[PDB]
Amino acid sequence: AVKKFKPYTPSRRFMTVADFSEITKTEPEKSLVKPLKKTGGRNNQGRITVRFRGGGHKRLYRIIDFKRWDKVGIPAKVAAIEYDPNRSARIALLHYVDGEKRYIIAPDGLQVGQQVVAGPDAPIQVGNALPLRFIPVGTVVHAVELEPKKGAKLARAAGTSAQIQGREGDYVILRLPSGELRKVHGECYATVGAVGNADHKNIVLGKAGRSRWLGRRPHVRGAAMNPVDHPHGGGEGRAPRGRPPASPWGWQTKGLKTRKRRKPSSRFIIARRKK
Amino acid sequence: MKRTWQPNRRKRAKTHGFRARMRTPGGRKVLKRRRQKGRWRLTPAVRK
RNA sequence: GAGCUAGCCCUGGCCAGGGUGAAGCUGGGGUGAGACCCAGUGGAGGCCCGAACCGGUGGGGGAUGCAAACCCCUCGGAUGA
RNA sequence: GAAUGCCGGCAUGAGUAACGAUAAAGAGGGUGAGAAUCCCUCUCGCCGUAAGCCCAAGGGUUCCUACGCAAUGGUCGUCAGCGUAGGGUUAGGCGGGACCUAAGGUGAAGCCGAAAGGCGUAGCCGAAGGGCAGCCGGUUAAUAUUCCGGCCCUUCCCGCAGGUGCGAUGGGGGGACGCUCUAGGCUAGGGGGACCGGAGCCAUGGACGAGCCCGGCCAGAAGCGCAGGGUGGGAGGUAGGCAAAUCCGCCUCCCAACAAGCUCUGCGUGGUGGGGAAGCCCGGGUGACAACCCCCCGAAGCCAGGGAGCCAAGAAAAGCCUCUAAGCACAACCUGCGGGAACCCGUACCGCAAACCGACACAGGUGGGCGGGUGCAAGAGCACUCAGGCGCGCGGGAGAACCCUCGCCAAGGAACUCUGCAAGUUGGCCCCGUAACUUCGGGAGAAGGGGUGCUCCCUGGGGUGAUGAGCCCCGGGGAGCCGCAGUGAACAGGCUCUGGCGACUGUUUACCAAAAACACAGCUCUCUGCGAACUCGUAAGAGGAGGUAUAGGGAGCGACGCUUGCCCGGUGCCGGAAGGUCAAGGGGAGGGGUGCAAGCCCCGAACCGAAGCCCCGGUGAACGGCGGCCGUAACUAUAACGGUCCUAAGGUAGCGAAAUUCCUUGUCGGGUAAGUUCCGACCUGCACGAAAAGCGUAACGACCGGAGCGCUGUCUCGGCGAGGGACCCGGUGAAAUUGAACUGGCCGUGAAGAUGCGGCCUACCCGUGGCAGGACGAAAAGACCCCGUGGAGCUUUACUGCAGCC
RNA sequence: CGAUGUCGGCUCGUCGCAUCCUGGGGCUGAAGAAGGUCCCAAGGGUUGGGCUGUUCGCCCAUUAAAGCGGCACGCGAGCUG
RNA sequence: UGGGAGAGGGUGGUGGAAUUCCCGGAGUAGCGGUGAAAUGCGCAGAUACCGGGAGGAACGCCGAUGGCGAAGGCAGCCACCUGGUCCACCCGUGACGCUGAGGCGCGAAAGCGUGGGGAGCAAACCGGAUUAGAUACCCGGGUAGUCCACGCCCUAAACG
RNA sequence: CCGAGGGUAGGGCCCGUGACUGGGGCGAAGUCGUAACAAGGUAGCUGUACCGGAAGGUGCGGCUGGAU
Ligand SMILES: [Mg+2]
Ligand SMILES: [Mg+2]
Ligand SMILES: [Mg+2]
Ligand SMILES: [Mg+2]
Ligand SMILES: [Mg+2]
Ligand SMILES: [Mg+2]
Ligand SMILES: [Mg+2]
Ligand SMILES: [Mg+2]
Ligand SMILES: [Mg+2]
Ligand SMILES: [Mg+2]
Ligand SMILES: [Mg+2]
Ligand SMILES: [Mg+2]
Ligand SMILES: [Mg+2]
Ligand SMILES: [Mg+2]
Ligand SMILES: [Mg+2]
Ligand SMILES: [Mg+2]
Ligand SMILES: [Mg+2]
Ligand SMILES: [Mg+2]
Ligand SMILES: [Mg+2]
Ligand SMILES: [Mg+2]
Ligand SMILES: [Mg+2]
Ligand SMILES: [Mg+2]
Ligand SMILES: [Mg+2]
Ligand SMILES: [Mg+2]
Ligand SMILES: [Mg+2]
Ligand SMILES: [Mg+2]
Ligand SMILES: [Mg+2]
Ligand SMILES: [Mg+2]
Ligand SMILES: [Mg+2]
Ligand SMILES: [Mg+2]
Ligand SMILES: [Mg+2]
Ligand SMILES: [Mg+2]
Ligand SMILES: [Mg+2]
Ligand SMILES: [Mg+2]
Ligand SMILES: [Mg+2]
Ligand SMILES: [Mg+2]
Ligand SMILES: [Mg+2]
Ligand SMILES: [Mg+2]
Ligand SMILES: [Mg+2]
Ligand SMILES: [Mg+2]
Ligand SMILES: [Mg+2]
Ligand SMILES: [Mg+2]
Ligand SMILES: [Mg+2]
Ligand SMILES: [Mg+2]
Ligand SMILES: [Mg+2]
Ligand SMILES: [Mg+2]
Ligand SMILES: [Mg+2]
Ligand SMILES: [Mg+2]
Ligand SMILES: [Mg+2]
Ligand SMILES: [Mg+2]
Ligand SMILES: [Mg+2]
Ligand SMILES: [Mg+2]
Ligand SMILES: [Mg+2]
Ligand SMILES: [Mg+2]
Ligand SMILES: [Mg+2]
Ligand SMILES: [Mg+2]
Ligand SMILES: [Mg+2]
Ligand SMILES: [Mg+2]
Ligand SMILES: [Mg+2]
Ligand SMILES: [Mg+2]
Ligand SMILES: [Mg+2]
Ligand SMILES: [Mg+2]
Ligand SMILES: [Mg+2]
Ligand SMILES: [Mg+2]
Ligand SMILES: [Mg+2]
Ligand SMILES: [Mg+2]
Ligand SMILES: [Mg+2]
Ligand SMILES: [Mg+2]
Ligand SMILES: [Mg+2]
Ligand SMILES: [Mg+2]
Ligand SMILES: [Mg+2]
Ligand SMILES: [Mg+2]
Ligand SMILES: [Mg+2]
Ligand SMILES: [Mg+2]
Ligand SMILES: [Mg+2]
Ligand SMILES: [Mg+2]
Ligand SMILES: [Mg+2]
Ligand SMILES: [Mg+2]
Ligand SMILES: [Mg+2]
Ligand SMILES: [Mg+2]
Ligand SMILES: [Mg+2]
Ligand SMILES: [Mg+2]
Ligand SMILES: [Mg+2]
Ligand SMILES: [Mg+2]
Ligand SMILES: [Mg+2]
Ligand SMILES: [Mg+2]
Ligand SMILES: [Mg+2]
Ligand SMILES: [Mg+2]
Ligand SMILES: [Mg+2]
Ligand SMILES: [Mg+2]
Ligand SMILES: [Mg+2]
Ligand SMILES: [Mg+2]
Ligand SMILES: [Mg+2]
Ligand SMILES: [Mg+2]
Ligand SMILES: [Mg+2]
Ligand SMILES: [Mg+2]
Ligand SMILES: [Mg+2]
Ligand SMILES: [Mg+2]
Ligand SMILES: [Mg+2]
Ligand SMILES: [Mg+2]
Ligand SMILES: [Mg+2]
Ligand SMILES: [Mg+2]
Ligand SMILES: [Mg+2]
Ligand SMILES: [Mg+2]
Ligand SMILES: [Mg+2]
Ligand SMILES: [Mg+2]
Ligand SMILES: [Mg+2]
Ligand SMILES: [Mg+2]
Ligand SMILES: [Mg+2]
Ligand SMILES: [Mg+2]
Ligand SMILES: [Mg+2]
Ligand SMILES: [Mg+2]
Ligand SMILES: [Mg+2]
Ligand SMILES: [Mg+2]
Ligand SMILES: [Mg+2]
Ligand SMILES: [Mg+2]
Ligand SMILES: [Mg+2]
Ligand SMILES: [Mg+2]
Ligand SMILES: [Mg+2]
Ligand SMILES: [Mg+2]
Ligand SMILES: [Mg+2]
Ligand SMILES: [Mg+2]
Ligand SMILES: [Mg+2]
Ligand SMILES: [Mg+2]
Ligand SMILES: [Mg+2]
Ligand SMILES: [Mg+2]
Ligand SMILES: [Mg+2]
Ligand SMILES: [Mg+2]
Ligand SMILES: [Mg+2]
Ligand SMILES: [Mg+2]
Ligand SMILES: [Mg+2]
Ligand SMILES: [Mg+2]
Ligand SMILES: [Mg+2]
Ligand SMILES: [Mg+2]
Ligand SMILES: [Mg+2]
Ligand SMILES: [Mg+2]
Ligand SMILES: [Mg+2]
Ligand SMILES: [Mg+2]
Ligand SMILES: [Mg+2]
Ligand SMILES: [Mg+2]
Ligand SMILES: [Mg+2]
Ligand SMILES: [Mg+2]
Ligand SMILES: [Mg+2]
Ligand SMILES: [Mg+2]
Ligand SMILES: [Mg+2]
Ligand SMILES: [Mg+2]
Ligand SMILES: [Mg+2]
Ligand SMILES: [Mg+2]
Ligand SMILES: [Mg+2]
Ligand SMILES: [Mg+2]
Ligand SMILES: [Mg+2]
Ligand SMILES: [Mg+2]
Ligand SMILES: [Mg+2]
Ligand SMILES: [Mg+2]
Ligand SMILES: [Mg+2]
Ligand SMILES: [Mg+2]
Ligand SMILES: [Mg+2]
Ligand SMILES: [Mg+2]
Ligand SMILES: [Mg+2]
Ligand SMILES: [Mg+2]
Ligand SMILES: [Mg+2]
Ligand SMILES: [Mg+2]
Ligand SMILES: [Mg+2]
Ligand SMILES: [Mg+2]
Ligand SMILES: [Mg+2]
Ligand SMILES: [Mg+2]
Ligand SMILES: [Mg+2]
Ligand SMILES: [Mg+2]
Ligand SMILES: [Mg+2]
Ligand SMILES: [Mg+2]
Ligand SMILES: [Mg+2]
Ligand SMILES: [Mg+2]
Ligand SMILES: [Mg+2]
Ligand SMILES: [Mg+2]
Ligand SMILES: [Mg+2]
Ligand SMILES: [Mg+2]
Ligand SMILES: [Mg+2]
Ligand SMILES: [Mg+2]
Ligand SMILES: [Mg+2]
Ligand SMILES: [Mg+2]
Ligand SMILES: [Mg+2]
Ligand SMILES: [Mg+2]
Ligand SMILES: [Mg+2]
Ligand SMILES: [Mg+2]
Ligand SMILES: [Mg+2]
Ligand SMILES: [Mg+2]
Ligand SMILES: [Mg+2]
Ligand SMILES: [Mg+2]
Ligand SMILES: [Mg+2]
Ligand SMILES: [Mg+2]
Ligand SMILES: [Mg+2]
Ligand SMILES: [Mg+2]
Ligand SMILES: [Mg+2]
Ligand SMILES: [Mg+2]
Ligand SMILES: [Mg+2]
Ligand SMILES: [Mg+2]
Ligand SMILES: [Mg+2]
Ligand SMILES: [Mg+2]
Ligand SMILES: [Mg+2]
Ligand SMILES: [Mg+2]
Ligand SMILES: [Mg+2]
Ligand SMILES: [Mg+2]
Ligand SMILES: [Mg+2]
Ligand SMILES: [Mg+2]
Ligand SMILES: [Mg+2]
Ligand SMILES: [Mg+2]
Ligand SMILES: [Mg+2]
Ligand SMILES: [Mg+2]
Ligand SMILES: [Mg+2]
Ligand SMILES: [Mg+2]
Ligand SMILES: [Mg+2]
Ligand SMILES: [Mg+2]
Ligand SMILES: [Mg+2]
Ligand SMILES: [Mg+2]
Ligand SMILES: [Mg+2]
Ligand SMILES: [Mg+2]
Ligand SMILES: [Mg+2]
Ligand SMILES: [Mg+2]
Ligand SMILES: [Mg+2]
Ligand SMILES: [Mg+2]
Ligand SMILES: [Mg+2]
Ligand SMILES: [Mg+2]
Ligand SMILES: [Mg+2]
Ligand SMILES: [Mg+2]
Ligand SMILES: [Mg+2]
Ligand SMILES: [Mg+2]
Ligand SMILES: [Mg+2]
Ligand SMILES: [Mg+2]
Ligand SMILES: [Mg+2]
Ligand SMILES: [Mg+2]
Ligand SMILES: [Mg+2]
Ligand SMILES: [Mg+2]
Ligand SMILES: [Mg+2]
Ligand SMILES: [Mg+2]
Ligand SMILES: [Mg+2]
Ligand SMILES: [Mg+2]
Ligand SMILES: [Mg+2]
Ligand SMILES: [Mg+2]
Ligand SMILES: [Mg+2]
Ligand SMILES: [Mg+2]
Ligand SMILES: [Mg+2]
Ligand SMILES: [Mg+2]
Ligand SMILES: [Mg+2]
Ligand SMILES: [Mg+2]
Ligand SMILES: [Mg+2]
Ligand SMILES: [Mg+2]
Ligand SMILES: [Mg+2]
Ligand SMILES: [Mg+2]
Ligand SMILES: [Mg+2]
Ligand SMILES: [Mg+2]
Ligand SMILES: [Mg+2]
Ligand SMILES: [Mg+2]
Ligand SMILES: [Mg+2]
Ligand SMILES: [Mg+2]
Ligand SMILES: [Mg+2]
Ligand SMILES: [Mg+2]
Ligand SMILES: [Mg+2]
Ligand SMILES: [Mg+2]
Ligand SMILES: [Mg+2]
Ligand SMILES: [Mg+2]
Ligand SMILES: [Mg+2]
Ligand SMILES: [Mg+2]
Ligand SMILES: [Mg+2]
Ligand SMILES: [Mg+2]
Ligand SMILES: [Mg+2]
């Protein structure tokens, strides 16, 4: 569960923190971290291209194995479960009987001391990774590749999962976390189970300072600006939008679909997201 | 109160310096222009 | 032209002293087991008071100024966005 | 002769303002042509978490000495950061480079762009981060971790001896890390000593004393001791660490294991080298053969890569160690020792400032370290004071008005005023005690009150010792003494009740607004399946994100509580394979020009032919919208009810004379002697109302209202006093402004407000201190207002394009 | 319009008189006392407070009375704002 | 000690029917709905039929006037964990008992909080009818909710 | 020293009263409809929720104290 605080400050009244219960090791593997280069939202031109970014806690990037078909047949003991500042999921340190060490994201139910393996022959058990062809229809699954050998791209956030719905030719049909129904190639790997830390979404940041720790700088409403700045700028006193609600750049931001029209992947998307 | 000129020798040399001017088309035109005018100093003096 | 200013990035540095006393932990009480209650321990916080430091609330002065924004008194923050 | 013309010169204001912090001066002696201002002595004052010392920027000779005083210095000048000249900066160990990487910059490969150029993995560059070997003292007018002295140390080269499978830009380990809190043991620093050293002193009533005053250390290789840091050992297996590996990783077995061991650092000791006060003698000499000891306090510093807790999860690379590959194994490397070698740049001086940034020797700005003592609960606060540094580069008088800053005040006590604006009051610590309300934290320092000095006596626990004395810390009880007064000086909340707005801490209009504005956690809509959407870019490339729907973008709303109604006709958005319209293009009935002709050329109907628009639906926390009239109930009044027009539908809950109410100071109630404000009500709401959210809400606020208590020079109503000015004298000496002036009052007149015209009145000539009614006084070619077929920012269903998208 | 600063307050007055009071009168539906109304008269006087930025006005407590106007709606090189 | 019957409870699994929706085929002029209608859906190809898929909820026959529980209440099937209760033997203990103010626990539905899920149904709501009117009853739509987890709420014609 | 009490300050309980407001009782000669009693013309009652001029309606679950 999430952890609450007595209201001994105005912010502790609402602040909630992760319990960190599954975490068994509080330092990262030295050989598996590299420095994460904070960007502040700036690109190679030095221009802000994603507003309101910067100033968050320093972080080291843990190298994550998003392939796993890298090491078919070679089992590994789950050595630890660790905090990762770069993602919402926890991470699991795997000690391969190879001697090799790698991190994967921690499935829900993973136990330190258990073993996992990857390959067409892997048992359908939590933590193992198989090509989608060989996972039974109906089993929930995470860290799914989108195309073969290109790396796990789907269902990586805390608590998420995709469900195998059926088969058709070289493809399996997944329900993604968004609810979209999509054909994914059967040679795409996936790891059985759902991502752990499902309580992530129940966290209450509690105070403005917490967003700042995360590198989230304050967001400014278009309504608070001037016409030079934003479609919603200006007006005497407060003002309603007085036009269809728009982005800083003028496009409408209430319903306007934005997926590219003739995109080749539409042939593989059966049903747009629900909800 | 704090004013606009806060001398810094590295900052001066790296910004207006001879090597800074030669890197860029606009900077080379500055040098070309100051030589044509006959300036005694083509580039700000900074002691290094 | 970002040696002023605004934002971010990398790497350093700084924040006297005092106050409040969260969680947890231990002991006791309680119970079928519990919740929980009490004491001690503990030392949390965009917590409190207050220097440095960062400010600039009210008033007075200054107004060919000491100063093209200053001075005095008072005042806000001061482990944090 | 005028252009608020241009350049220059010189006036007026004027011997006027001013001479730059109110920390403060006085005298004697000297120097010199000249002295308040330079030197010296004594006295006085100011700083002392600095106004003292050290370092880094920046500055660039300003440093030291001699000789000068025209100018610079707000006066003076014999002086000086000024003029002339001469001298002065010394490094293997300090800092930087011959080392390493960070952001970033550059950039083989590669990619992109009309040109110029933009990117770009590696690599390279890039530091105040990593790494790396010097401490104490002496010396100069001026440099010193640099010279000298003592004791240490580093690298490279060569050699010797011993040892080893040696060998790297390759593999591995390590380097290597947060915040808060913190243990033990030390050190820096400090306090005390009846002990050790010392020149001396006995005053003015007393003291020859366990008297006063002064000092009582610093560095130091090996070794040793104390305290810490780091680190398990052996074998077997091995498929991973882009080759190899004995290394590292993984598995298993064996002893070891909060130990020791090994290793590294700090501290102490340590051969040795130094230093060494007051006082009084002309920076030096003496003190002095100086002594150099004991106790207490004690770091934020050290051991350190220590420990614990927590979530926001806390650089890289090289040095270093290990592994092996080519190689090479008469080499090579490792260890010890010895000799030799060891480069370039900085070093003066100022450095919270008269030498830096501010045009000035400018009350402003400027990063790091040291920053002593006593007392006040603590402290870097406050008062005083050490070391050290200053009295702020005009002075001397005077003792008006007025001004500033300050002190006090009879009686009253907010009567002041827009407002208690301002100023009083309160004020630290210890104890007692503390309300509504509440989100159970708070509200709270609520409020309110008691205590507070000194002396003697008895006593409780702690630290250091030893368990004791001594020192040091925290107490408790009794009895007394003095004053107006005991946080006796300085530093140190006035309080309460009640509304509005915003939940809160935060942010903002640098330099007229700090707020109710922005942000904010939180809520909802919406886009986005990842080569994501979106953003910057012509592109390449980037951000997003080395993220993946519990995620990322956009929008609104803004903790939390209780909620968020009706209208989808119009606009937006979403869905709709029909239909209508629809461009290029396709098609080619039909027709035309020309040729003797084959032919060449042109026009061109039906039909086919996208998005878009039309059309059909959906959609409100999308843009938005949310009525009128007539009638009707046992008195009146009103209208639950009915009728009727219109609309897409007619405002629900809640709230309401409100940050909204025109009429308006609505009406009524409350408070007041009296209340246009305030609070509580009512509801004909000119013109509230539900995420441009509605109604509440504990806590919070330098926000904006209303009231009371305390207390006051705010006021009745003013008075006195202080200092800095104002005034006088000596020194230096501005300014805007200025058509010229020999520049009075009234009543008139005049372009309609006359010193300047008329008539009359008044008036000897010239200043000084004062006051502001006039000179339509100064300043700024009015910001308002209009005008100009003047400009610019902004908007949109103005026009017309363009990017972007389809 | 190459600038003639504005409401209200404070301060400081001075003037007019169509007089609020005080002095002198005539008429009265003037018995007295007190008023009413007109005439003469500008010498002096013409309060403190609550509300509101207010001028004004209303109200409280008084008063002989609580006058009305002008002076760039007197007076910002006098202050406030 | 030995046996029994049971929708007693909790957990994890798991089956088939049906409704709805979506895809493919086939097919066309209506379907639906009512007392009778209309709104509604339908030539943009509905209904009716075949095949395929998704998803939630409830478990037909057995089923009974039946069974179990203290009450609320419990119904496909399997497994595990677990309560109560009856019987036979008449073996053990030796009045160890009954009740029970307070206390504690449980407590249908609706409702509330956080998150999930959402097929059918359906307060509110919109529309069609009915009617003198019809803020109803009937019809076509439709959001909470109904379902799951956790935490509350603690009521009832909680009745025999 | 204690001490009647007086004073300052802050709490507790009770009473009276208050612009205005909430429903309640009664009156009865009114307006609206007809919710319950019959199958009361939608069987009723019910806890709860949402809604409506009003009685009441609907939903979910419960009871029979329901006609046929
Ligand atoms: Mg958990
Ligand atoms: Mg909490
Ligand atoms: Mg807590
Ligand atoms: Mg808690
Ligand atoms: Mg709070
Ligand atoms: Mg609080
Ligand atoms: Mg936690
Ligand atoms: Mg965890
Ligand atoms: Mg760490
Ligand atoms: Mg690394
Ligand atoms: Mg990275
Ligand atoms: Mg990055
Ligand atoms: Mg770059
Ligand atoms: Mg660039
Ligand atoms: Mg952006
Ligand atoms: Mg940004
Ligand atoms: Mg994590
Ligand atoms: Mg989490
Ligand atoms: Mg959240
Ligand atoms: Mg972060
Ligand atoms: Mg955000
Ligand atoms: Mg915002
Ligand atoms: Mg604005
Ligand atoms: Mg702009
Ligand atoms: Mg624009
Ligand atoms: Mg715009
Ligand atoms: Mg707008
Ligand atoms: Mg507007
Ligand atoms: Mg606006
Ligand atoms: Mg408005
Ligand atoms: Mg605005
Ligand atoms: Mg606005
Ligand atoms: Mg606003
Ligand atoms: Mg608007
Ligand atoms: Mg709007
Ligand atoms: Mg609009
Ligand atoms: Mg794809
Ligand atoms: Mg600077
Ligand atoms: Mg400079
Ligand atoms: Mg520099
Ligand atoms: Mg520099
Ligand atoms: Mg620089
Ligand atoms: Mg340069
Ligand atoms: Mg020049
Ligand atoms: Mg030359
Ligand atoms: Mg140049
Ligand atoms: Mg800058
Ligand atoms: Mg850093
Ligand atoms: Mg601090
Ligand atoms: Mg405690
Ligand atoms: Mg603990
Ligand atoms: Mg704080
Ligand atoms: Mg604090
Ligand atoms: Mg504080
Ligand atoms: Mg700042
Ligand atoms: Mg100020
Ligand atoms: Mg003040
Ligand atoms: Mg003053
Ligand atoms: Mg000024
Ligand atoms: Mg000041
Ligand atoms: Mg000051
Ligand atoms: Mg203060
Ligand atoms: Mg503070
Ligand atoms: Mg502090
Ligand atoms: Mg803070
Ligand atoms: Mg002329
Ligand atoms: Mg002129
Ligand atoms: Mg001129
Ligand atoms: Mg001129
Ligand atoms: Mg000129
Ligand atoms: Mg003069
Ligand atoms: Mg002073
Ligand atoms: Mg002199
Ligand atoms: Mg002289
Ligand atoms: Mg001297
Ligand atoms: Mg001191
Ligand atoms: Mg200079
Ligand atoms: Mg020197
Ligand atoms: Mg001179
Ligand atoms: Mg001279
Ligand atoms: Mg000369
Ligand atoms: Mg001079
Ligand atoms: Mg000067
Ligand atoms: Mg001389
Ligand atoms: Mg000088
Ligand atoms: Mg010399
Ligand atoms: Mg040397
Ligand atoms: Mg070399
Ligand atoms: Mg390099
Ligand atoms: Mg380098
Ligand atoms: Mg360096
Ligand atoms: Mg060095
Ligand atoms: Mg040394
Ligand atoms: Mg020297
Ligand atoms: Mg080797
Ligand atoms: Mg690291
Ligand atoms: Mg570091
Ligand atoms: Mg911190
Ligand atoms: Mg300690
Ligand atoms: Mg001491
Ligand atoms: Mg020790
Ligand atoms: Mg191997
Ligand atoms: Mg000596
Ligand atoms: Mg001697
Ligand atoms: Mg001697
Ligand atoms: Mg001796
Ligand atoms: Mg500290
Ligand atoms: Mg540690
Ligand atoms: Mg976290
Ligand atoms: Mg790197
Ligand atoms: Mg070989
Ligand atoms: Mg060796
Ligand atoms: Mg060289
Ligand atoms: Mg050199
Ligand atoms: Mg030097
Ligand atoms: Mg300063
Ligand atoms: Mg400094
Ligand atoms: Mg000076
Ligand atoms: Mg200065
Ligand atoms: Mg010291
Ligand atoms: Mg004190
Ligand atoms: Mg103190
Ligand atoms: Mg202070
Ligand atoms: Mg002292
Ligand atoms: Mg002085
Ligand atoms: Mg005088
Ligand atoms: Mg007085
Ligand atoms: Mg008073
Ligand atoms: Mg009083
Ligand atoms: Mg006030
Ligand atoms: Mg005080
Ligand atoms: Mg109270
Ligand atoms: Mg409480
Ligand atoms: Mg108090
Ligand atoms: Mg209070
Ligand atoms: Mg005394
Ligand atoms: Mg005191
Ligand atoms: Mg005091
Ligand atoms: Mg006193
Ligand atoms: Mg003081
Ligand atoms: Mg205070
Ligand atoms: Mg209050
Ligand atoms: Mg108000
Ligand atoms: Mg409010
Ligand atoms: Mg606020
Ligand atoms: Mg605000
Ligand atoms: Mg709130
Ligand atoms: Mg706030
Ligand atoms: Mg703060
Ligand atoms: Mg401002
Ligand atoms: Mg401004
Ligand atoms: Mg400005
Ligand atoms: Mg400005
Ligand atoms: Mg201001
Ligand atoms: Mg402001
Ligand atoms: Mg503020
Ligand atoms: Mg703002
Ligand atoms: Mg805001
Ligand atoms: Mg909200
Ligand atoms: Mg762009
Ligand atoms: Mg572009
Ligand atoms: Mg790219
Ligand atoms: Mg990227
Ligand atoms: Mg990236
Ligand atoms: Mg992402
Ligand atoms: Mg808020
Ligand atoms: Mg906001
Ligand atoms: Mg807002
Ligand atoms: Mg509440
Ligand atoms: Mg409605
Ligand atoms: Mg609409
Ligand atoms: Mg529409
Ligand atoms: Mg409609
Ligand atoms: Mg429109
Ligand atoms: Mg058709
Ligand atoms: Mg033809
Ligand atoms: Mg022809
Ligand atoms: Mg809604
Ligand atoms: Mg409309
Ligand atoms: Mg709207
Ligand atoms: Mg009637
Ligand atoms: Mg009203
Ligand atoms: Mg209101
Ligand atoms: Mg407002
Ligand atoms: Mg209004
Ligand atoms: Mg109006
Ligand atoms: Mg009004
Ligand atoms: Mg009004
Ligand atoms: Mg009134
Ligand atoms: Mg008021
Ligand atoms: Mg007001
Ligand atoms: Mg009314
Ligand atoms: Mg808005
Ligand atoms: Mg508003
Ligand atoms: Mg709205
Ligand atoms: Mg505030
Ligand atoms: Mg405020
Ligand atoms: Mg006065
Ligand atoms: Mg005095
Ligand atoms: Mg005086
Ligand atoms: Mg004076
Ligand atoms: Mg005086
Ligand atoms: Mg004289
Ligand atoms: Mg003349
Ligand atoms: Mg005239
Ligand atoms: Mg005249
Ligand atoms: Mg005249
Ligand atoms: Mg004349
Ligand atoms: Mg004439
Ligand atoms: Mg004349
Ligand atoms: Mg006259
Ligand atoms: Mg005048
Ligand atoms: Mg004047
Ligand atoms: Mg004149
Ligand atoms: Mg004048
Ligand atoms: Mg004038
Ligand atoms: Mg002009
Ligand atoms: Mg003009
Ligand atoms: Mg103009
Ligand atoms: Mg105007
Ligand atoms: Mg005009
Ligand atoms: Mg025109
Ligand atoms: Mg014209
Ligand atoms: Mg324009
Ligand atoms: Mg777009
Ligand atoms: Mg004008
Ligand atoms: Mg002029
Ligand atoms: Mg002018
Ligand atoms: Mg009579
Ligand atoms: Mg007469
Ligand atoms: Mg008179
Ligand atoms: Mg007169
Ligand atoms: Mg008034
Ligand atoms: Mg009025
Ligand atoms: Mg009135
Ligand atoms: Mg009277
Ligand atoms: Mg007047
Ligand atoms: Mg007028
Ligand atoms: Mg007027
Ligand atoms: Mg006037
Ligand atoms: Mg005036
Ligand atoms: Mg003025
Ligand atoms: Mg005025
Ligand atoms: Mg004037
Ligand atoms: Mg004037
Ligand atoms: Mg005023
Ligand atoms: Mg104003
Ligand atoms: Mg049955
Ligand atoms: Mg028996
Ligand atoms: Mg229940
Ligand atoms: Mg339920
Ligand atoms: Mg429910
Ligand atoms: Mg649904
Ligand atoms: Mg009707
Ligand atoms: Mg609802
Ligand atoms: Mg709901
Ligand atoms: Mg029953
Ligand atoms: Mg008495
Ligand atoms: Mg009924
Ligand atoms: Mg009936
Ligand atoms: Mg019935
Ligand atoms: Mg209702
Ligand atoms: Mg009605
Ligand atoms: Mg209904
Ligand atoms: Mg029942």
XYZ file of C-alpha atoms (C1' of nucleotides) and ligand atoms in Angstrom, chain D residues 97-101 124-127, ligand 90:
10
model
C 50.450 23.866 -17.797
C 54.012 19.130 -19.787
C 47.574 14.524 -16.180
C 42.035 13.361 -16.105
C 37.458 13.915 -17.508
C 40.111 16.081 -28.912
C 39.397 20.531 -26.100
C 37.151 22.225 -21.703
C 37.516 23.000 -14.040
Mg 42.192 18.708 -20.544
